[PDB]
Amino acid sequence: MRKYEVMYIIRPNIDEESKKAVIERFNNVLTSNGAEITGTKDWGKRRLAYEINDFRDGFYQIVNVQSDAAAVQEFDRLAKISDDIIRHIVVKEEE
């Protein structure tokens, strides 16, 4: 087991309820993977120097979890299936 920090972007235009749906979904997946919570923060809306698909800005969101080591391998594709999410990255925590 090891620590992990993860960032991901959700769509700026999304309705707050649907945002609650995708966040409870990402949390249910994150706990399905056995990734224990350590801490989290909400960067929220921020302007972008460049668009990814088209959007001029995005909702940043981050999590910090103690976990495998096996889970990220399943978490990535499940982070790929959703059209609502834009980008996701999982960096190891070794400050």
Partner 1 sequence: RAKRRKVCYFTSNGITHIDYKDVDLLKKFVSERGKILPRRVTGTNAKYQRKLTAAIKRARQMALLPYVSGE
Partner 2 sequence: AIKKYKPTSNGRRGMTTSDFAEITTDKPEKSLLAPLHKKGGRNNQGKLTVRHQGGGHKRQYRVIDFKRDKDGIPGRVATVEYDPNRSANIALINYADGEKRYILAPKGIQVGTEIMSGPEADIKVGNALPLINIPVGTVVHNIELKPGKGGQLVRSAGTSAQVLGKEGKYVLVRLNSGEVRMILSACRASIGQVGNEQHELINIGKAGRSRWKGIRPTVRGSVMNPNDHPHGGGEGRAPIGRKSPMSPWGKPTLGFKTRKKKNKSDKFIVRRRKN
x/- contact string, 45-74, with partner 1 (CB under 8 A)?
A: ---xxx-x-----x-x--------------
Closer CB to partner 1, 29 or 60, in the complex: 60
CB of 76 to partner 1, least distance (A): 14
Q: How far apart are CA 28 and CA 43, in angstroms?
A: 21
Closest CA to 63 of 39, 46, 30, 47: 39
x/- contact string, 76-95, with partner 2 (CB under 8 A)?
A: -x--xx-x------------
- Rounded to a whole number of angstroms, the CA Rg of the chain reads 13
Buried/exposed code over 49-62 (b: 16+ C-beta within 10 A; e: otherwise): eeeeeeeeebbbbe
Binding site for RNA (CB under 7 A): 2, 50, 52, 54, 69, 72-73, 76, 89-92
